[PDB]
């Protein structure tokens, strides 16, 4: 945090050369009651390259940038062909232009400062270039404010490809210079066309994305023939997974994570809720860490049955998010209502019993299970617990 | 839908707010018979607020948009460079942007969405606009319709880079003026164009690709030098499938959705099917509900051998969509023809005797099967049809 | 092929109607000599409705532009602000659009159609801006060519964004106009702009979505610090497989057939390759069915090892398209050189043999194997052979 | 390389015809001082055609341009309507497009190629527009200079939309003329900004498609409700996949490859690490190559437990690029810290100890891993190394 002080420093620099240099070779009348900041500006390009580290083709713009190129030719008044290697100076724009897209690269969207960078240099170059054209008007009296004004009014209704005409070429050296900065207008207004339409293109990736799924789902089922009481309640899943956890599947989110990390997660996941079974407890902690990777999320819709009472039955579900009800044979008699970090279904891994009530949802649930057979092939190879359950 | 008529109404009045305020900093002569909507409006932005419920970083639009900041300004005829804050009130329309944003943000396209709002952002922007060259005119006796019509005129010339030159600036501080809206002019059309762009370029996505993938399995067919007359069926069956289901393929549809819909839009499409066979009637419901959910999609085309007569043969399908016809083994002597809801090939997964008959397709089929060693190992844990079948 | 005509037909009765309505309002000195192509154009669609065969949200178009709603405004002389409605006919362009996206939707490109038909309508609407701009012009004498061709150069100047402003708008009626043309001029040319980077974005896909997988596999193997003797032959592969089947995988792309016609696929790629083996040769025919589709393809570079010679080998290989040679356990005495159609590697399957030769590769390969336990697990299911092999 | 010379000079000869065939219809006074660079260039066209070795649909621009078509017409001063078929040389640069379009396919990028050769395209149609324009002028005295650069300022003012107006049409033939270069103009600017357009936005693609997956997993896990502080060592877990292997995941680059270059990568990335196990000493060289295509990458962060001594614990784990650092069970007494290269965890392959030691991470790892029942698999097919383990 030290060096970020000088990193701005160094664009303060840099940007006050671009402001200045082609100020300064229209107007010669500059220079001599502000050379104090030459010195300064011009000490700090040449301390710059020290505290950035020495040849390479990356280096030599801050190295054609870092020597005084300038001060000779505003102190021996070198002719109009001549004097224009003082632009060498704004060689330093690549090398700000490269600190300033890595120092701050995830901060911020890499489109949007690419933008941002877009601007500005359009700016600082539509500067240069209404100081070229007043350079090569006619010599006349008038005062040097509007005078500028006018030559910024044109570069600005020849960049922005406006043209109103209102002010026009006349000699033909005029003409080529506006030839080539027509040119490099219509360059830089599709340069800012271009990235706007970037910008904003991938500014809606989660929202249409599952816009897109929902369409596929529905845009097929309608093919099948399907009830619209059950495309209804399609849809109405389709849209709790978008106004809970944006779109995005359970099992290929923390898919993208390496082992530990997903262990850990999983860990944070099912924390309250694995110390609670009478079936685990007891249990070594080398045995949750085995189980609680095989845990497969399921989601159920309201009124949806869960376990449905007579069944053979096999697995077992631990509650995370929503409510559920657990109802008789008949569903008539309610025997109790489970909420979140507590579980039903146990009595299908240690038991060959059919189930023994219906379980029905009462809200969307967000519910974890884990089988019957992943839950005895895990516990095959731990042999206390595969005593500790028989 | 009670409140829907609220935001309707907070919408019309920060939009009378938006082309009153503009208008009225022009022209001094309004707002004497015309504050009685103004305190009507005022009075419906101050009881927003608490219908809205109260500070946050995106709550300070609406409350400095919610007191009355102008009204002050027009009553006690402050001067022009401190009117200008009854501006304030054009905070309100973030609001209006934010909420329209999220109340119909699925009723449509979420791009078609952004490029709507634009567009009035942009026809209320360039009444502003208008409104404040107006404002720094020279002053003549002119009539106020025909001195507003003209700045329009200017205004949408500009933001629309035409650029006719027929009025343009002539002070200086028109000009720093021109020089501002000639770069909002660039941006909101670059903002139009690129809105535009990225509308367009998703608006065919089935529909192409669809187009890539019938590219690619040609491009790859033409290399390893395959018949004609075999390419031609390949292309004609991506045709059918382009024209029936709209490209998708059905078993990655219906792998996007939970259990409890997989397995209710199964138990939809195979419902009068699986009550038609004399092998799973008198079965349980619960062996009904893991057959459905194995049964595989296939697709035959005209002519094509389904079931050749006299080969080993596992495994048994069901007929949805289309027709078939059973031939005898010189295939000369039809048999019979199906249709949709029957089943063949049933005389293989309880017996083990070989083909018996040759099964021609005759139009496209969508026909599932269901293989031999799916269902005697979900058969192995059901004794009581293990013990049916034998 | 009958009806293709009729469409076209109607397409040219629409574009008559089209050119000549707007032209027949400004001058009403036409239409009086050119009645009879109305009278046939108007039974023209009169009779396409029931050609076309009645009520919808996307009928009424054609229906509203069958109705003679003209031919009573020019023989009645109907003035200015009633004789509009003789524009009712300009609905049919809604048929003939919803017609053409979907008789040629797949002879071409989706985004090349939408292009080409919106180029056709803004012609086509430039006509009608021209029309209405020449309608409200002082009337003053001029000839009636020259006072077209300077209305038709207007709205390309406005239209196209260029504004000379050459010929500007006079009264305040010409001003509105002007400025409605404006929006729908900056309208179209974005919409233009939206279907040119819609279409150029997406021409160039297998060959950019191959340059991308050819610097993800080099950006990360550089980051292993591999050779650059082995990076450089990744490369010429990656080269191969562009040239040859343009970058796509053999596995990933006969995956999107359905079983019948990929069994066609593998059945006539595999075909001279399987009536020559002495292993397969008096087996039946649903045993190549069976073998024929867990053959998987390896393409192997100029120069590396096949079989090595010593080791314990499993596999069998068939070549497809490449050469390969046969060498001796020194590597010096070439016993011969296999070529396309061929096979190694037999004595593999049938014996516990250690592989008896070293098979190199001389150009790129392209050949099919078989491994040793999928081919005795397919083997097990078929007794003959099964008997045959022993 | 004696080819590609011989490129340079067709795209040299086309260049020179591009250049000077409008230049010399307008200026009759050309040609005869400059007839023997014509003589050479057709000599240079006529045999550029048995140098590419001839009849085809994509022959004949190279066939059409062969031929002298000019020549009589500037040897026999041909009338205006007629002189124009000397254009038919310029069908000589959908040759060289064609041939320069993959001649360099993938030394560049393709969007990139393309956009320089219609910026190349647009300057050289430029030319001939102003041509054109200066041709269908009124003839008067003036400097063929200064004449031309006029022309050729209108034909920039007209094609880049910008427009100043200040030099327009006078007589009809010229406002054709200008109607149809407007088209032309906003035609090429629509084809510019759409590869701009197209060229920026697939500009970042790993770099925008890492900044999606963290924050896809980011925005999920705060709707489990996840720690702060473990929601911070993802990010930084993310931050370091980027910064170094440029977020690709490790076991889907190389599943990109065949099996003998995946097998080849794998052996150099395993090099200087299987040399060194005391257990896999003395064993095949075909043993190496079954077990070094199993080993699986796993990350562990900075502090992170790999081995925890007490457990059960089955696999045996390989560093490859990190650090580590071993500990007793307390983790008070440092045993020894091991760096790349080495390898720890090979006490439970061979035997069924439960762990003697913790074994804590230091940076991160990038550290490979096999599988205890992955490496009893592959060991029991290979039987002296089976008894050798004994
Ligand atoms: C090249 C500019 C036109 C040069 C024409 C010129 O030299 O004019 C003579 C006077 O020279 C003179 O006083 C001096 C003439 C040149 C003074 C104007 C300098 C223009 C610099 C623009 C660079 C853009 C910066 C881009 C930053 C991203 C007469
Ligand atoms: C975004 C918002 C940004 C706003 C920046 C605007 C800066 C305005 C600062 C300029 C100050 C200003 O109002 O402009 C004139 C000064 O003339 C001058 O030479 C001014 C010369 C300065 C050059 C101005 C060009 C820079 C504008 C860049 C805009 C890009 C923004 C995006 C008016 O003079 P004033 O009324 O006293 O009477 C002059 C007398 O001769 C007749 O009345
Ligand atoms: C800033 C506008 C130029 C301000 C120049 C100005 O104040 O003019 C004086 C008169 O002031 C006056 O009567 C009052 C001058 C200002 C009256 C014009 C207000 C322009 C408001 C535009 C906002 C866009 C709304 C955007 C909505 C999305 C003289
Ligand atoms: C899309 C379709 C939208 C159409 C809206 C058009 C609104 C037209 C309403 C304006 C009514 C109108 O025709 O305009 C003039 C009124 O002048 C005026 O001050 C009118 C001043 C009102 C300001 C008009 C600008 C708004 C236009 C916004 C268009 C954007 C649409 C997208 C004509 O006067 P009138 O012939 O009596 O003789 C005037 C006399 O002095 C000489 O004949
Ligand atoms: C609305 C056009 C301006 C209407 C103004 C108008 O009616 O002018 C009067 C004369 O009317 C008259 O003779 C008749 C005036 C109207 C004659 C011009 C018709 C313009 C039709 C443009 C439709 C585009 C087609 C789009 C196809 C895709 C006076
Ligand atoms: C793409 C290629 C397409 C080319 C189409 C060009 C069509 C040209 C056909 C027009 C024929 C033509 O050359 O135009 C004039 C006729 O004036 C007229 O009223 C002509 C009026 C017809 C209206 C022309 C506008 C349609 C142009 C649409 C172009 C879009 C293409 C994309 C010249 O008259 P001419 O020299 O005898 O002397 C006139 C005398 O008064 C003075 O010399
Ligand atoms: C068509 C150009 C307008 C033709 C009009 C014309 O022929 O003018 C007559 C004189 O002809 C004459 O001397 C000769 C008139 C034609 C001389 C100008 C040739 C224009 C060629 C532009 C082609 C673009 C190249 C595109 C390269 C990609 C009078
Ligand atoms: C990108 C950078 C590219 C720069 C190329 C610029 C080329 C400039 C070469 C032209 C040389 C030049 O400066 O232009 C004039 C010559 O007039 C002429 O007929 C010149 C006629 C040549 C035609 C020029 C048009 C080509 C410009 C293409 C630019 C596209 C670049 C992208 C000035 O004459 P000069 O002062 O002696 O006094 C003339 C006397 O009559 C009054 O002083
Ligand atoms: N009286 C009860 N109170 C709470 N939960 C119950 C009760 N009876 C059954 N359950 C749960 O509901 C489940 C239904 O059958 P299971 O064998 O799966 O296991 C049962 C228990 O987990
Ligand atoms: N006479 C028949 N009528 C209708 N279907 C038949 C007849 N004979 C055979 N099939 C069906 O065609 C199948 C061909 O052999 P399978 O053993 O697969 O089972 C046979 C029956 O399902
Ligand atoms: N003399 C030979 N001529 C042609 N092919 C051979 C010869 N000897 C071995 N091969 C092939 O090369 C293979 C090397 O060992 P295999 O046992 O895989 O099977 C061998 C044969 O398929």
């Given at each position: 945090t030290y060096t970020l002080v000088w990193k701005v420093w160094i664009l303060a620099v840099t940007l006050y050369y671009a402001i200045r240099i082609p100020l300064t070779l229209v107007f010669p009348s500059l220079f001599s009651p502000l050379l104090p900041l030459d010195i300064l500006a011009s000490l700090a390009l040449i301390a710059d390259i020290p505290l950035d580290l020495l040849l390479a083709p990356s280096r030599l713009p801050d190295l054609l940038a870092a020597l005084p190129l300038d001060l000779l030719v505003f102190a021996l008044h070198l002719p109009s062909p001549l004097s224009?290697?003082?632009?060498?100076?704004?060689?330093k724009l690549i090398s700000v232009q490269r600190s300033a897209t890595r120092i701050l690269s995830y901060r911020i969207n890499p489109a949007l400062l690419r933008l941002l960078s877009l601007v500005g240099f359009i700016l600082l170059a539509a500067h240069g270039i209404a100081c070229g054209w007043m350079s090569l008007?006619?010599?006349?009296?008038?005062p040097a404010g509007t005078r500028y004004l006018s030559a910024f009014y044109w570069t600005i209704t020849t960049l922005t490809t406006?043209?109103?005409?209102d002010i026009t070429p006349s000699t033909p050296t005029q003409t080529v210079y506006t030839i080539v900065i027509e040119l490099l207008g219509a360059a830089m207004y599709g340069l800012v066309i271009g990235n706007i339409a970037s910008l904003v293109s991938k500014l809606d990736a989660a929202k249409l994305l599952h816009r897109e799924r929902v369409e596929r789902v529905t845009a097929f089922l309608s093919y099948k023939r399907i009830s619209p009481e059950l495309q209804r309640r399609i849809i109405e899943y389709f849209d709790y997974l978008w106004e809970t956890?944006?779109?995005?599947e359970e099992r290929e989110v923390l898919?993208?994570?390496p082992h530990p990390l997903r262990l850990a997660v999983a860990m944070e996941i099912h924390g309250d809720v694995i110390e609670k079974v009478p079936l685990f407890?007891?249990?070594?902690?080398e045995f949750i860490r085995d189980i609680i990777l095989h845990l497969e999320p399921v989601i159920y819709g309201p009124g949806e049955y869960i376990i449905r009472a007579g069944e053979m039955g096999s697995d077992v579900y631990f509650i995370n998010r929503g409510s559920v009800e657990v109802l008789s044979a008949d569903e008539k008699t309610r025997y109790a209502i489970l909420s979140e970090g507590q579980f039903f279904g146990e009595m299908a891994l240690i038991l060959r019993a059919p189930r023994t009530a219906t379980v029905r949802a009462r809200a969307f649930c967000d519910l974890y299970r884990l089988d019957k057979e992943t839950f005895d092939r895990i516990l095959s190879r731990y042999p206390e617990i595969a005593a500790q359950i028989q």
């Amino acid at each position: 945090t030290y060096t970020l002080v000088w990193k701005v420093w160094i664009l303060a620099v840099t940007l006050y050369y671009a402001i200045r240099i082609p100020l300064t070779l229209v107007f010669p009348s500059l220079f001599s009651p502000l050379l104090p900041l030459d010195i300064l500006a011009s000490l700090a390009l040449i301390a710059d390259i020290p505290l950035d580290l020495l040849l390479a083709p990356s280096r030599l713009p801050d190295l054609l940038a870092a020597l005084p190129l300038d001060l000779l030719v505003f102190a021996l008044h070198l002719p109009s062909p001549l004097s224009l290697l003082s632009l060498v100076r704004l060689l330093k724009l690549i090398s700000v232009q490269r600190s300033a897209t890595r120092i701050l690269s995830y901060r911020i969207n890499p489109a949007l400062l690419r933008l941002l960078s877009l601007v500005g240099f359009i700016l600082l170059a539509a500067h240069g270039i209404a100081c070229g054209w007043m350079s090569l008007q006619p010599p006349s009296e008038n005062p040097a404010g509007t005078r500028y004004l006018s030559a910024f009014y044109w570069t600005i209704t020849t960049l922005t490809t406006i043209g109103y005409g209102d002010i026009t070429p006349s000699t033909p050296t005029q003409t080529v210079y506006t030839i080539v900065i027509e040119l490099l207008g219509a360059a830089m207004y599709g340069l800012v066309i271009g990235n706007i339409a970037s910008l904003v293109s991938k500014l809606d990736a989660a929202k249409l994305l599952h816009r897109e799924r929902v369409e596929r789902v529905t845009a097929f089922l309608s093919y099948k023939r399907i009830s619209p009481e059950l495309q209804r309640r399609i849809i109405e899943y389709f849209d709790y997974l978008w106004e809970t956890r944006r779109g995005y599947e359970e099992r290929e989110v923390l898919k993208e994570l390496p082992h530990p990390l997903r262990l850990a997660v999983a860990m944070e996941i099912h924390g309250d809720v694995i110390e609670k079974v009478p079936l685990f407890k007891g249990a070594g902690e080398e045995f949750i860490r085995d189980i609680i990777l095989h845990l497969e999320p399921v989601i159920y819709g309201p009124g949806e049955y869960i376990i449905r009472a007579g069944e053979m039955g096999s697995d077992v579900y631990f509650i995370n998010r929503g409510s559920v009800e657990v109802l008789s044979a008949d569903e008539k008699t309610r025997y109790a209502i489970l909420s979140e970090g507590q579980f039903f279904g146990e009595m299908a891994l240690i038991l060959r019993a059919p189930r023994t009530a219906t379980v029905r949802a009462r809200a969307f649930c967000d519910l974890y299970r884990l089988d019957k057979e992943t839950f005895d092939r895990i516990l095959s190879r731990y042999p206390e617990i595969a005593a500790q359950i028989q």
